[PDB]
């Protein structure tokens, strides 16, 4: 997490260099803004190496929210509700499907007794 913290810190440093550089070119001495743009490019190169050190990896709604201007907190939140709702959905399908399996299986059990013993093996297999 320290790499993310230092690359984020330098990100804030260089965006602050864009702030003070814009204020400097608005309220315009050369050495201040020349040293400010060399600090800009230096912070750029530290973005290069710092993020090369970091290395972290419509379906890709993240970048869509970054470009359009949305908060990915609702993205990952809808992902929590999607994994929970999908878990209850699949488990519900398997529950009702098991109800059909033992319901119809027991119906065949009371249908004929000579087929009851093997279908018991069917309801006891894959265990």
């Amino acid at each position: 997490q320290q790499e993310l913290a230092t690359t984020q810190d330098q990100v804030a440093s260089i965006i602050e260099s864009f702030v003070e550089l814009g204020v400097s070119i608005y309220d315009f001495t050369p050495e201040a803004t020349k040293g400010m743009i060399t600090n800009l490019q230096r912070n750029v190169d530290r973005l290069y190496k710092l993020n090369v050190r970091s290395n972290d990896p419509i379906p890709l709604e993240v970048v869509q929210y970054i470009e359009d201007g949305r908060n990915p907190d609702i993205y990952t939140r809808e992902f929590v509700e999607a994994i929970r709702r999908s878990n209850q959905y699949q488990r519900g399908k398997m529950h009702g499907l098991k109800q059909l399996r033992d319901s119809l299986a027991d119906k065949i059990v009371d249908e004929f007794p000579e087929l009851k013993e093997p279908v018991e093996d069917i309801i006891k297999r894959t265990s």
Partner: protein, 68 residues
């Protein structure tokens, strides 16, 4: 007559093999897991109560036995 009834009963066996799974694969319920069961958004889930779902499972499980 005697030859057609076998084909009709067979086609009904297949149509029941599909229709029996069609209802469960479309209308069913979730599970409480350990916290809650119903989601706040139940627009496309059309959750049916477990009573009519169980009775429907019993009926669809009975029709195939009757036809058999």
């Amino acid at each position: 007559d005697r030859l057609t009834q076998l084909q009709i009963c067979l086609d009904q066996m297949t149509e029941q093999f599909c229709a029996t799974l069609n209802y469960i694969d479309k209308n069913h319920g979730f599970e409480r897991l350990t916290v809650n069961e119903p989601q706040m958004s139940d627009k496309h889930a059309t959750v049916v109560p477990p009573e009519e779902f169980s009775n429907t499972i019993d009926e669809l499980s009975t029709d195939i036995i009757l036809k058999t």
